[model samples]
Target: VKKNDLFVDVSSHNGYDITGILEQMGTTNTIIKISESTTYLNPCLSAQVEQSNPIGFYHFARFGGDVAEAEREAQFFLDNVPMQVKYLVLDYEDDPSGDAQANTNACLRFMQMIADAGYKPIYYSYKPFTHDNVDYQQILAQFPNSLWIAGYGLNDGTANFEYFPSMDGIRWWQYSSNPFDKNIVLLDDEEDDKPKTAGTWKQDSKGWWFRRNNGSFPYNKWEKIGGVWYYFDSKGYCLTSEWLKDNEKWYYLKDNGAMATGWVLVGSEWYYMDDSGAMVTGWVKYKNNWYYMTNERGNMVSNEFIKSGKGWYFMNTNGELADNPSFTKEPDGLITVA
Candidate 1:
């Protein structure tokens, strides 16, 4: 049977050719099961991704009341699924316990986790079970028009509208389950609806990336947000816990994405950055005293003896290395100059 404007849901259980089935059924959209609680990464995912057009992925929920498990499952799904897939779905059909409220709460938490990860969250379940166990009003309040309910009245392999569920916020309806699970999308063009807004921080498996108010991110440039400067690479991934050089000026970004200024100790090495967040080399005069920093990476020589050019000089604990007639090294590694 020919199907249009519909999607096919498949998992590792169906080890058939996804391309052949979609060509025979004439459906481009395919929703592949990416993960479950214990079992993860569908074996046919690569094949489904290679074949389907505008692909989506779903995660089978097994956590009953534990929101932590629900969030982990969401993370696993996000970690495995590709970046192009927008439809992050929660297949909430399994009712493990008798606590309906707890189960519905878990479902809500799972969907919220997906939404937090910047994906269009879709909740999938049958009509009667959803009405009986799920808090449909709560789900609708949190996520509007995000339901995909199933009602199989006929055992045929074709689209049957008679089995459509009588429920609000029904965005997709699973009409047939004979040969394969087939769903008809009730909404038009659900793609391109991104959750990314301007002037906010977004995170993926990669590090944090900032989005400007105009929806464009800092690409291979430095941008100051909230009075702190951050550098983003070509792909818009923020640089943290590393050193950066722009226009021959060295700078260090802390682990929290804040640019380091002044004297900062990094792994037994002392690096100095001035008020402008630029690393200083050579002789730097601070507080009416001179200090010596390496010419290479601008690491300040501190608490040690340095042999610079003509004479041997000792750098104090505060990175102060001044000219002295004579210097004596004490037994406790401290140096006294006269």
Candidate 2:
């Protein structure tokens, strides 16, 4: 495509009105320009024109300016741009202070706010505008979905701006501002299909959890509660609890006031062992070193023998079982084994 192929009119206009010129040249492929400030008065103008013509909006930034004003300007654009218009560009070329950081932050805040309001926003600037003036990577990384680029020079001139090679995922590339071409617009048709349900939790195999509609699932295990890690199952029921210590046995407290014992592995793998060291199926972990007896087995046995200095306190008697003294100060408080 030629340099003027991606062109748009740079002339400024007043009043939230451009429908006449836009509609007249609607078939010419020229992009209509609208100032962010004017959009505040008539937010629907952009959407109206965009519904029938190729149009773009630009914001004029004032360094150390009012953030509220900037937000309002962006909101106006979002409120007006029709849903049919998917391509929205944010012009950040002329900054009052040339302070790349401030301009970048202001632009980011403005664009993000606009994006949150529904439309996809693009960032516009030339090679030098980003290369020597701003942190291109930082801004690009922050707004991964925005269109970036510049448009200057002839078929090949010294004032050429090539940003596509540097920015890998750049969506729109503006090559010039006159004699527009319909092909260079680079219209994208992407859509976000993230689930929007509420009141649910997503758990990974690694034990991480995430609240529904909260974006990504967590990578860490569910936090331990009452010394056990509790998690809601796929059925939305609180069905699993993980024990933290190895070689610890857990006993299930049934509604009938009955206690059944078993063991659970790190991944909530449950195992029940008999007095003869025989393994049984249908077991789950309940509490610290405690297991739920899936079978009708009414008792639980420890796989390891009680050893001295291992914090082996008797379950029936409140004394340290390994101490041999039998009564090491009546076992009243919870026992802590080192």
Candidate 3:
């Protein structure tokens, strides 16, 4: 079995198990839109996340109703959300015929809130939303690495991932909206079933186990017992990867929540690690690729449009497309994405 040109489906929901369906399709990625506080939690979340492999949290909201509401929503994710969450998707479908710049600004504000709290946020909306509602390009400029597009068949039900009309390099694709929402994750955090952190975890056996309590906590953290290493999720379950949740964060991790000691190859692009397992903060060479690691959490750099000083270029984490790029070497010899 070769896993090639695979598409992720963000169909995990409250009443159904599309995750189970895609598992049979050999698809391991899925996303579920969460609408409640801690009460919104589903025990199936762990099992689904574990079973689906790379799962995302889609927070639903209609910005026109309340821009401040976005902030409140951020609280849920900040205070809640599983430790192994792959992506934080914000569904801000206020109005498709509203002011584009105005709507985008509001969305940006909301996204910043989540980002500020140390979580990567992906903008999710219908394919048409970009064309009429928000200035998708500006949203891209705000967070070039974050995007999840949705659209019906593009035709009469045929899944044509090759020809997504616009929105430039979408990170996720909701190819269908029928029996179940089918998605395709353009980027991968790690291989299937293997979360960034997982395995036997120690929690308060008194039923006090949770994401911010007697036992559970946040962050896709890791734990090393005796000698072996295991990654623990935000909600405190042994996580399931090694990549920074598929290099989806401004930060990166060596699964098990540690830095890389040597070189780490996420998909096709390769990165070097200091003796500390963190990607090289300054510069490194690993064959044809001349990579510069950002000290600002060692963010992976990308190259797209207006090549800089002939000094910067990069590919997306998946090593498939060219994304925004920059190269800024700090006085400390550590590099930052400019």
Candidate 4:
């Protein structure tokens, strides 16, 4: 009903026809687990169930060890099924030993191939099978948006999985095996299925911004400003000093007509330059105040140095520099030079 509500149904290859039973009980979603035995029967039943409600098909991985066999099984579904299914999930729980890696890769490649053929591919796997023995993170990284985690039980929190603890891109979580009751399916089969919700934070709008030659703010497309990551559509822009403010969002004119805005985390720290190419002391934003950064000579030489210099400087364990040195400029003019 809502955006994040859970729906449950029975999963089987054959034997009993629980379609009517599930439909009468309001279980609309069904996943037909097709294997070697029920390959001929499940597709017809799947098409039948689709006439009444939502239905999708999943193939039980028989050749998780054999890439060719795995491909054939997936091809079997593609050849037999005439209807268009929006999602295709690869069941990887029962993958045989020594074939885990091959099976996972084969399934992923097959899914991508299916996607190329105009269908959304999904990978279905359990926590133990995904985390302990196999490289689920690699799969998640490759297919960030298509993973369907099968984490069963009442208190088995899915977030505990080290890879992508937030589960930002997870599309489905099979959190329970017995989620269906006589009437409505419970959101959590038990208490452990309670999803640890992630917090939402604001992100910067896409555009380009100019950071003054000595202005504060990274010139990169993706910058960590004010502790939040902001993405820019373009790079190599400069911001004017008048538009700069600490911890405030400001729009600036870029070399191009496009406008870019981002909050300033650090203010412009000043360093004094010498004729001998030696940079003196400076003042940097620290703890909401401008603290004088001194050199070995203990001189306050702020104005001579550029706030956003190009070279690397030394900082304490807390990221506070004892003395601000002018950054060395790159030969190609790509980096900043005080």
Candidate maximizing lDDT:
1
Candidate 4 or 3, higher TM-score: 3
What ranges in model 2 sit over 4 Å off? Answer: 1-31, 36-51, 55-69, 79-84, 96-98, 155-166, 179-187, 194-338
Question: What TM-score would each prediction reach against the true structure?
Answer: 0.54, 0.41, 0.48, 0.45
Q: Which candidate comes out best when scored by TM-score?
A: 1
Query: What is the number of backbone collisions in each predicted candidate, taken in the order shown?
Result: 0, 10, 25, 19
lDDT of 3 by residue, 203-308 (tens): 5543212243344353455545433344555555554234553343322454444444445555454555543333454454332234555535444553221234
Worst 10 residues of 2 by lDDT: 329-338
Better of 2 and 4 by TM-score: 4
Per-residue lDDT for 277-318 in model 1, tens only?
787665432321234566465443433445544344666666
Q: What does the lDDT read for residue 292 in candidate 4?
A: 40
Q: State each model's CA lDDT, in order.
A: 0.70, 0.43, 0.53, 0.45
Sort the candidates on lDDT, descending order: 1, 3, 4, 2
Q: What is the C-alpha RMSD of each candidate to the true structure, in Å?
A: 26.8, 23.9, 16.0, 19.4
- Pick by lDDT: 2 or 3, better one: 3
Clashing pairs in 2: 7-177, 43-80, 47-82, 248-289, 249-289, 249-290, 250-289, 250-290, 250-291, 282-294
lDDT (Cα, tens digit) per residue for candidate 4, span 1-338: 21122334344433355666555435465555544422443544554455334334566666665667767777776665445656666777774557457656777676766666666676777666766545666676776656666554453322111222234345665654443321111111112234432322222354345352355434535444333233334343333222222232323322332232211212343432222213323343221123244444332322222233344344443546546553543122111111
